[PDB]
Design a binder for this molecule. Structure first.
Ligand SMILES: Cc1cc2nc3c(=O)[nH]c(=O)nc-3n(C[C@H](O)[C@H](O)[C@H](O)COP(=O)(O)OP(=O)(O)OC[C@H]3O[C@@H](n4cnc5c(N)ncnc54)[C@H](O)[C@@H]3O)c2cc1C
Ligand SMILES: CCCCCCCCCCCCCCCCCC(=O)O
Ligand SMILES: CCCCCCCCCCCCCCCCCC(=O)O
Length: 561
């Protein structure tokens, strides 16, 4: 009906991070007709624009509300795995932390055309940085907005940096400068524009919407890719399960580009008969291409946390004191600094200072620390954000304190995504696989992370401010007690890469080639976090945008690869 008698040179499945970038580059010269299909709504919520309102996006109608299969190894728990559901995708709902990891992470892919020397200039092309001048590591011209966070907690941010130095860490002035070693303490830059979320809808898609060759449908859930093997286009509903199934057709030479993210791309490819035959057979799905790797190599960065209250003399100095009054009302001072100056607590996603640490002489840091100048009231950091949102207007005072989140940033465990039913509107079968690596390296990383965070809090610099420890608490002393606390509290830092991994020729574990072309289908590609062979250290948004920029340069003939 909206797609009736139309032919497309590109159909983008999903309108998320990578999709927004491609919708921009692919529709640029005007020759090519581009369709974007997004299950979620338009990007208009105020909870998207204001960074601190990330607290409200968790477990909201703008999230997929995904829960994992029971995890035997995690105290028999289902794990929440947040994913954005709207134009912009997870760039619209994330913590805005701007990280690339280290050159070593790209060299460790071992995929021809995709070394550190190859990807660098693509990071730079994407970026306008407010706080680093232009050079080999920073752009001044690209659609992304990157800045130093516009909120500083003068007492607790200073205390954390002094504490990190006190325990023997060196400062890193730029976690994204590949001439520096990745390890050290300092500030995480954010994907913000003077304290407004700079998601890839705002930066890439929204400025080019008036282009006549670009069509974008929202509330448009893709149920499968129509394949003949050669991609014909895709099927979708414009009213969810109980809505008419339409179909969208490629023009001659046209391609379907999968941009439904490391969770939904493999789910859709499987419902499209691409992935392991046995999984397909289980639900009477015809096998079009039998690929081992579809839904495999799920890499996510797991987290735990410590948290401590401030001494009574420091009541009122926390970010929670800057955002909420003693009755849980948003402070009129916070709203004013935000709207008049793009300053203050509402510009914060909380977790934008920290460190990369080697717990045991690894080639690259295994541990990322995110310091928060506010106290966790749930050992699950993501649950704490949900409760912080739900706390508003409850007539209660959030206690002043700090959190350190510990993230296994180069993890050795892998998980999977597959099918629980034949209904393409059914939640996928999600297994994060945290703490399954055979050497128990990921648990070792987080356990040593807890020891590190306790040394930092017991430092003279943080001892000044802190009064005891709430999580894990003085009950948790031995390494076995620490590991048990981790099993019970472990949560996502919300990466998720690797589920349609790219590989060299003659790697049967791979799903796409170095050109992002799906093995044994013609005119079908994947351009999202699915393709990352081995997850880099740090949050995964900037690497997705770098892959999208390079994919678009490839598709429009401006570069090889
Ligand atoms: C809560 C959270 C916090 C994060 N924090 C950070 C951080 O601070 N910094 C950072 O760099 N990274 C962060 N990340 C990760 C980062 O946001 C993602 O890695 C990146 O945005 C992935 O982009 P993508 O295009 O691969 O997927 P997405 O951006 O998730 O795009 C997938 C899109 O496909 C849509 N879709 C799914 N199924 C269908 C269907 N059937 N039909 C149509 N559309 C469909 C989804 O609704 C979504 O809009 C965070 C992630 C989350 C979820
Ligand atoms: C706890 C999470 C904080 C949520 C922030 C709520 C802010 C309340 C202000 C409501 C009215 C003023 C709106 C000002 C700006 C709204 C969006 C924008 O245009 O940037
Ligand atoms: C915004 C103010 C929050 C106050 C509550 C403090 C509790 C801290 C919990 C730990 C941080 C959770 C981060 C969730 C966002 C995901 C980002 C990431 O870790 O990559």
């Amino acid at each position: 009906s909206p797609v009736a008698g139309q032919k497309y040179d590109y159909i983008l499945v999903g309108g998320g991070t990578a999709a927004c970038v491609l919708a921009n580059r692919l529709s640029a010269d005007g020759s090519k007709r581009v369709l974007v299909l997004e299950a979620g709504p338009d990007n208009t919520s105020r909870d998207v624009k204001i960074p601190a309102a990330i607290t409200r996006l968790f477990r909201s109608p703008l999230d997929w509300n995904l829960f994992s299969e029971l995890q035997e190894q995690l105290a028999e728990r289902q794990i929440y795995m947040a994913r954005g559901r709207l134009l912009g995708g997870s760039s619209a709902t994330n913590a805005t932390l701007y990280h690339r990891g280290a050159a070593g992470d790209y060299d460790a892919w071992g995929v021809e055309g995709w070394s550190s020397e190859d990807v660098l200039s693509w990071f730079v092309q994407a970026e306008t940085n407010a706080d680093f001048g232009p050079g080999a590591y920073h752009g001044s011209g690209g659609p992304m907005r990157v800045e130093n966070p516009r909120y500083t907690n003068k007492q607790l941010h200073t205390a954390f940096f002094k504490a990190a130095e006190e325990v023997g860490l060196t400062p890193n002035s730029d976690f994204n400068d590949w001439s520096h070693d990745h390890a050290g303490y300092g500030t995480f830059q954010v994907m913000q524009d003077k304290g407004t979320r700079a998601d890839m809808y705002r930066q890439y898609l929204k400025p080019v919407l008036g282009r006549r060759n670009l069509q974008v449908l929202t509330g448009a859930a893709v149920t499968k890719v129509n394949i003949d093997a050669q991609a014909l286009g895709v099927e979708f509903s414009t009213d969810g399960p109980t809505g008419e199934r339409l179909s969208a057709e490629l023009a001659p030479g046209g391609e379907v580009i999968m941009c439904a993210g490391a969770v939904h791309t493999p789910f859709l490819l499987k419902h499209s008969g691409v992935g392991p035959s046995a999984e397909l057979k289980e639900f009477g799905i015809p096998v079009v291409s039998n690929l081992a790797g579809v839904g495999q190599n799920l890499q996510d960065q797991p987290a735990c946390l410590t948290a401590a209250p401030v001494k009574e003399k420091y009541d009122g100095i926390a970010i929670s004191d800057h955002i909420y009054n003693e009755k849980g009302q948003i402070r009129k001072r916070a709203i004013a600094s935000y709207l008049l100056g793009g300053r203050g607590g509402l510009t914060s996603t909380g977790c934008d200072r920290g460190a990369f640490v080697r717990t045991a002489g690894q080639a690259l840091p295994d541990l990322q620390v995110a310091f928060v100048p506010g106290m966790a009231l749930d050992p699950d950091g993501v649950s704490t954000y949900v409760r912080f949102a739900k706390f508003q207007s409850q007539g209660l005072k959030w206690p002043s304190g700090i959190t350190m989140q510990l993230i296994a940033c180069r993890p050795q465990s892998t998980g999977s995504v597959g099918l629980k039913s034949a209904d393409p509107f059914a939640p996928p079968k999600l297994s994060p696989g945290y703490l399954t690596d055979k050497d128990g390296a990921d648990l070792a990383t987080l356990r040593k992370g807890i020891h590190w965070a306790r040394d930092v809090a017991r430092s003279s610099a943080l001892s000044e401010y802190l009064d005891g420890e709430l999580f894990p608490g003085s009950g948790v002393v031995s390494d076995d007690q620490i590991d048990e606390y981790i099993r019970r509290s472990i949560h996502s830092s919300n990466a998720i890469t690797g589920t349609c991994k790219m590989g060299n020729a003659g790697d049967s574990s791979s799903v796409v080639d170095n050109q992002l072309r799906v093995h044994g289908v013609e005119g079908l590609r994947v351009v999202d976090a699915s393709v990352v062979p081995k997850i880099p250290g740090g949050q995964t948004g900037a690497p997705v945008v770098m892959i999208a920029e390079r994919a678009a340069a490839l598709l429009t003939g401006k570069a090889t690869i």
